[PDB]
Amino acid sequence: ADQLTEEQIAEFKEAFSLFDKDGDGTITTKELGTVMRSLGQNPTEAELQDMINEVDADGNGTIDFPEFLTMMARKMKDTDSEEEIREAFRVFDKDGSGYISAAELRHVMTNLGEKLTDEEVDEMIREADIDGDGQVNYEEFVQMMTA
């Protein structure tokens, strides 16, 4: 009841390739750091290595796509639509304020959606920030993610 289509695997591969920026089929700690840093975080090497370690099933020190797919498909099978949105909001609400600033979310979107144009990201943010106060709060994020 939790089969994967070709298109689903390609979507998980797009998420994998966000991190595997050199395209050699593995995610290294440096590549993970490049993404996290682009989001304004500053993970340490030990923190990056621990993150790799959670997904690296064969222990060779990097994440390959079968490891990534295993983790992502299991997460998808185990988490409902409302729960996964809730958790994703808390990932991007770094200080736990209940808000993501419009400027922060724009930067997140530009870096995670690499082929988006500025016009497209602008439209997404304008739609997300329902009341236009320059912040995307929790319920605004839920509603943007459920539409």
């Binding site: 979507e11 998980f12 797009e14 998420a15 966000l18 991190f19 621990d50 993150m51 959670e54 997904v55 990534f68 983790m71 992502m72 997460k75 998808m76 988490t79 996964e84 949105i85 958790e87 994703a88 808390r90 990932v91 991007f92 997140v108 979107m109 995670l112 959606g113 988006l116 497209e120 439209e123 997404m124 739609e127 943007m144 993610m145 539409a147």
Partner: peptide
């Protein structure tokens, strides 16, 4: 838990991009 969540949130945001492009067109 935390690590899985970070990777999965990226996918969920990419999924939102896909749906947004579909709604903008149709």
């Amino acid at each position: 838990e935390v690590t899985v969540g970070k990777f999965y949130a990226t996918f969920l945001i990419q999924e939102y991009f896909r749906k947004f492009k579909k709604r903008k067109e149709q």
